[PDB]
Each structure stands twice: as C-alpha cells, then as structure tokens.
Write a protein that binds this ligand. Sequence first.
Ligand SMILES: Nc1ncnc2c1ncn2[C@@H]1O[C@H](COP(=O)(O)OP(=O)(O)NP(=O)(O)O)[C@@H](O)[C@H]1O
Ligand SMILES: Nc1ncnc2c1ncn2[C@@H]1O[C@H](COP(=O)(O)OP(=O)(O)NP(=O)(O)O)[C@@H](O)[C@H]1O
Ligand SMILES: N[C@H](Cc1cccc(Br)c1)C(=O)O
Ligand SMILES: N[C@H](Cc1cccc(Br)c1)C(=O)O
Ligand SMILES: [Mg+2]
Ligand SMILES: [Mg+2]
Ligand SMILES: [Mg+2]
Ligand SMILES: [Mg+2]
Lengths: 262, 262
Amino acid sequence: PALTKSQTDRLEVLLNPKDEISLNSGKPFRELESELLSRRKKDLQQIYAEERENYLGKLEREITRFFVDRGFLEIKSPILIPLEYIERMGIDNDTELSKQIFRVDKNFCLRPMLAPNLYNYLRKLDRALPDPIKIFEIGPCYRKESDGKEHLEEFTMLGFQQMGSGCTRENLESIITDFLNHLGIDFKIVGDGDTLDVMHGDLELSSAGVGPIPLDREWGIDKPWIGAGFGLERLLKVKHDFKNIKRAARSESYYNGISTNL
Amino acid sequence: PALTKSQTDRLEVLLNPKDEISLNSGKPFRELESELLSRRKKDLQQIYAEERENYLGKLEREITRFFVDRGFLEIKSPILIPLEYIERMGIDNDTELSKQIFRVDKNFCLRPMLAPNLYNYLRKLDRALPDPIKIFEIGPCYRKESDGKEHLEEFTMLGFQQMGSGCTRENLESIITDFLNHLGIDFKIVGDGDTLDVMHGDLELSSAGVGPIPLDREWGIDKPWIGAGFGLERLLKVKHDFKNIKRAARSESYYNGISTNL
Ligand SMILES: Nc1ncnc2c1ncn2[C@@H]1O[C@H](COP(=O)(O)OP(=O)(O)NP(=O)(O)O)[C@@H](O)[C@H]1O
Ligand SMILES: Nc1ncnc2c1ncn2[C@@H]1O[C@H](COP(=O)(O)OP(=O)(O)NP(=O)(O)O)[C@@H](O)[C@H]1O
Ligand SMILES: N[C@H](Cc1cccc(Br)c1)C(=O)O
Ligand SMILES: N[C@H](Cc1cccc(Br)c1)C(=O)O
Ligand SMILES: [Mg+2]
Ligand SMILES: [Mg+2]
Ligand SMILES: [Mg+2]
Ligand SMILES: [Mg+2]
C-alpha cells in the first residue's frame, strides 16, 4: 500500500536534508519510520558526544566575532521596548508592520526590529566615541505572521549600523559580501536614501540602507550612515538546506534541525 | 554650597565603582560633573578601541563554554511560551509568581523561568541520549517586579539540569562551586526533594533543586535530577560591584555599567 499523506508528513519530520532516502519506494511506513528514527537518534548522540552547541547560539557567536573583529561595538538592548518607538519609526496603519506587533501591557511591545535601539545608541555614543561609530546587535525579534515556510513569529535578527565617515553604498556592499562569504552563504544584492535587499533566490536574507533619510531627525541623528538587518534563522535555513524555517528556530520540536519527537 | 540631591543623583549616575572620587567634598557640581563625564567618555573609548564586547553577551559566552565543556547540551528554546506551562508548573494564585507574568495575547506569555522548556527537553532527549542527560539554557526571562536594586523586569537566566545517574546533592554543590569559583564570585550555599539557595550576602544568586519531586509527573519525568537557575545580571552586579542591577541590564542607559547619557 502507498503511504498515507499523514504517514508521509510523519516521515518528512524525521527526514534530514542530507538523507539519501526516498519515501516514494515500496517499503512499508513502519520500516521507513524505524530507519529514520534510528538515524536521528544517532545524529543527536553524535552532537551530545562531541560539540554540544546549538546552531542558533553558535551562529550568534560566530557573527559576534566577525563584527567585533571588524571594529563594531557589541550592543545588548531591551527586547521589550516602548510602544512609542514603533510610531516613531514611521510605522503607521498604512504599513504591514503596524498589524504585526505583539503588544505587551498598555505601553510596551516586543520589538519587531532593532532599528529604534540602534538609533538611540548611535545618538548617545556620538557624544563619546571617535568617528565613525560602528555598532551591532543580535537578538530576538517578534512579528505576527501568516503560516509560511520562511517566517517565524519569534526570530533572531542581526542589525549593524555605521555612522559618520565612510558611509558609502560601496562600503556597505563590501561588509555584506565579506560577511556572507565568511559564512559560506550564496547571495545576490538587488537595488536600484538608497535601499538594497540581499537575496538568496526568492528568499530575502537582509534589507540594507544608506542614510541620511528624513526619519533620522526624529531620532536625533544628523550624520550619514549605512546598515543592514539579517535574520539568523534564514541564514541557517539556507546553510543547512532546511525545507522549512521551523527547523532553525528556537524550538521544542527541533534541535539543530533534528526532530526531538522520537 | 552643598550639592542638591538632584545633583548628587546625576553624579551617582556617572560614578563607577572603581572611582576614587568622593562627592562629599567642597568642589562645585559643574566641576565634579565635568570630571566624571571625561572619565566615562574615556572608559567608552577604551572599550571601543580594544575588546568591544558587551558584558552580558560575554558572560553568556563564558558560561556557555563552561557547561559545554562539562558535557551539557546547549539548548535555545522559545521565550514566548504557552500560558498553560505556568499552571502546569504549579504556579497558582497562592504564589507570588502568578501575579508576575507578562501575558501576551490570550494564550501566551513571556517565560518567567526556564524550567518548563528544560523539563520538555529532558523528556524528549531521554528517548535518544545516553544516561545521564545534561542540558543547559541561557536567555531572557520576564517578571513584573516592584522597584528594587536587585530586580529587573527583563533579565537573563542560566538554567541547567541533569537527569538520571549521578543526581546527588553533592554533585549539584560541586557543579555550583566549580562554576562560581571559575567566574570569581563569592558565595555561600544555604539549605537544610531537597532545595538550596546560593547566596552572596543577602542577594540570591541561584535557587537549586534535587529531584524527584511530585511535579515531575505532570511533565512526563520519572527519573532523579539535579538543577539550578542563576540570574546573569546578578552575577555581573556582584562581579563588578554595581550598586544597582540596572547597571548590568539590557539597557539603553548603561553600556558595561557606564552611563550612556554623557
Ligand atoms: N517573520 C520573520 N521570520 C524570520 N526572519 C525574519 C522575519 N521577518 C524578518 N526577518 C528577517 O529580518 C530581516 C530584516 O527585516 P525586514 O527587512 O523588516 O523583513 P521583511 O521586509 O518583512 N522580509 P519578508 O517578510 O520576508 O518580506 C529580513 O531580511 C529577514 O531576514
Ligand atoms: N526580577 C529578577 N531580576 C533579576 N534576576 C532574577 C529576577 N528574578 C529571578 N532572578 C534570578 O533567577 C534566579 C532563579 O529564579 P527564582 O529562584 O525563581 O527567583 P526568586 O526566588 O524570585 N529570587 P528573589 O526574587 O530575589 O527572592 C534567582 O536566584 C535570581 O538570580
Ligand atoms: N532593524 C533592522 C536592522 C538595521 C539596522 C540599521 C540599519 C538598517 Br537598513 C537595518 C532591520 O529591520 O533591517
Ligand atoms: N527555571 C530556572 C532553572 C532551573 C532548571 C532546572 C532545575 C532548577 Br532547581 C532550576 C529556575 O527558576 O531556577
Ligand atoms: Mg515581513
Ligand atoms: Mg525587507
Ligand atoms: Mg522573585
Ligand atoms: Mg529563589
């Protein structure tokens, strides 16, 4: 008998991208399931015996070293942010993002992006640090999303920003290119303040920008800048050839892309 | 003229624990403020020129290396968790913690602790990994709190748990002792399933436990265990002799304990 769709769904959960197994063959569900269960248990045993590091944590640490080594200051700013920061960012009711905010209490929200906190740090650090000011942050961000293989409601974003001298599109593309070649992730930069997107096929890895833009004034910024935001789970999805970004997420259902339901 | 209380408050923001400056002296506010501003700008310049790492990020990475090296698997689990996990943990209306939860939407909350996710990982990994199972997680936790120099509403917690063989109070105290001696943090273990607290004077650094306890059954756990939870900002507060834990927090107001309002 052919596998049911439910049985195929179950096998897909246990299938990893490097497997050379095809579900289409005549072998019965129970034997395919037992084979994949054995493989995934061995995969977890090998992680536990050797490296023991979580993909998302390890990627954050690798990205951190890259940017610290390039002269960027590591920022850790609040995840629970004032709701007023959303409106200040120009996110009004005519934008998609206005409907995607997780509100907390009556005056706070889970941050959907890093830009407000990075703007505040640029303004404050400009009183103390020499030109140019280079900063970055990695951490959780939150958006309400429709179901989709490329979106999480709880994800992790890298944001970096440079302000002052050297804030050219060329320098921005050079940072992006060195960064993704360091990680081993294929990309194309697409673009015509200037804006550009970093694409892996149809998947957006990053949106980047060149300042100054009119919004800067509301944040007390009056210098040129360049910066970009990257989703870490999307980087992991591409690097490991996951079919669904849920394999890369903070999760109780997957560990380093391996099903925990064994 | 003596300094006003408001002027003293302003100087205290700029005062760092290693400063050898006393505000009590006759010198005028403006000169004391200008001296402290110069010192704090130089402190930020030195960080930017040399290490560029954030105290909270760096501590997370150091703790991660300690536990990975000791055989613990690094977990990254959801911060936004089902509200049902709170009740399942035995947190009912007769507990303080029930009134401290940040609710999100109608069925989710910001996690106030790591225990639910660690229980779930122990249960699932017991199907794949050899005895004993050793896991840990570091990440944001959230609690509504009264104003106080030892509490944050947004903080970072280390949780570790071992399940199976070797789950003795002696082994638990040995992990705690090696860990805090590695970090260079003075402590006392106080205690009479068994429970114990790790104290720095009157400040609680950790609460730890030895299983099994009746609650385990609700989470599908039926093996002995040991574990503990530590607040990272409290570790930083003790290590750096901060007077208020706000100096150690995810923050827009302090960077590595240095005021950003210069
Ligand atoms: N829901 C999400 N899940 C995972 N990653 C995300 C999510 N939203 C944004 N990101 C990442 O964060 C980066 C910067 O955010 P932003 O440019 O605002 O996203 P976006 O324009 O909404 N992308 P998309 O929703 O795919 O059209 C993106 O390039 C993504 O890599
Ligand atoms: N609001 C907070 N801010 C910073 N750290 C915290 C906070 N709550 C708990 N922690 C840390 O997390 C550890 C384990 O949490 P738990 O034992 O539930 O805290 P607790 O018993 O409420 N401590 P306390 O509130 O100081 O009496 C504690 O030992 C603290 O180091
Ligand atoms: N907030 C993030 C990060 C960021 C930071 C600075 C400049 C730029 Br462009 C983007 C984003 O959504 O892209
Ligand atoms: N949830 C955390 C971490 C934790 C994990 C396992 C056992 C123990 Br005890 C404590 C706490 O509040 O202590
Ligand atoms: Mg989007
Ligand atoms: Mg975009
Ligand atoms: Mg408490
Ligand atoms: Mg306690």
